[PDB]
Amino acid sequence: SLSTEATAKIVSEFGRDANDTGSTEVQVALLTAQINHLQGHFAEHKKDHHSRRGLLRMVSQRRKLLDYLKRKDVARYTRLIERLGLRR
RNA sequence: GGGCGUUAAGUUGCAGGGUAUAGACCCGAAACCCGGUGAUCUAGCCAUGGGCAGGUUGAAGGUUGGGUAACACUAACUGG
Ligand SMILES: [Mg+2]
């Protein structure tokens, strides 16, 4: 997984408030990260029909939690995705 | 006793009949062997030049959108 030194960084950048691991801004970023990284890893082997599942489980959550914004505070949704370019 | 012999005179020319050896009365093979001339036709190849009116179909690749976590994938336009 992402280095312990990593998550603690991204959070202080996306976390709705100074140092907080829970809000979508923080949730998403923390997820998209491991997703972008693993992408390369999977570009290798590509036979790990197990590790890939996790890739899905978390990715399936990305689009999932991302909806919470719409269903709730939409004002940030677009402001959050525009950050990682997600959705496209 | 028997077989072959012993009272046939030959031989050398010349003309001729026949034979042997040679092409052997004459004309005729299909082929065999030897040494040369031929790839200006044609078969293959080698180098170097040239030729193919018009009309048609429309692959791969690509750009865009859709699409997938990323690919797959998909539809147009292009491309040829
Ligand atoms: Mg007698």
From Swiss-Prot:
This protein is called what? Small ribosomal subunit protein uS15
The annotated subunit structure for this chain is:
Part of the 30S ribosomal subunit. Forms a bridge to the 50S subunit in the 70S ribosome, contacting the 23S rRNA.
Similarity field: Belongs to the universal ribosomal protein uS15 family.
Upper lineage:
Bacteria, Pseudomonadati, Pseudomonadota, Gammaproteobacteria, Enterobacterales
Q: Which PANTHER family match?
A: RIBOSOMAL PROTEIN S15, BACTERIAL AND ORGANELLAR (PTHR23321), SMALL RIBOSOMAL SUBUNIT PROTEIN US15M (PTHR23321:SF26)
Report the protein's function. One of the primary rRNA binding proteins, it binds directly to 16S rRNA where it helps nucleate assembly of the platform of the 30S subunit by binding and bridging several RNA helices of the 16S rRNA. Forms an intersubunit bridge (bridge B4) with the 23S rRNA of the 50S subunit in the ribosome.
Positions the record marks as coiled coil are: none
Question: Any stretches that span the bilayer, and where are they?
Answer: none
Question: What is the protein's species of origin?
Answer: Escherichia coli O157:H7
Record SUPFAM superfamilies: S15/NS1 RNA-binding domain
Asked if Ribonucleoprotein is a keyword of the record, the answer is: yes
Here the disulfide bonds are none
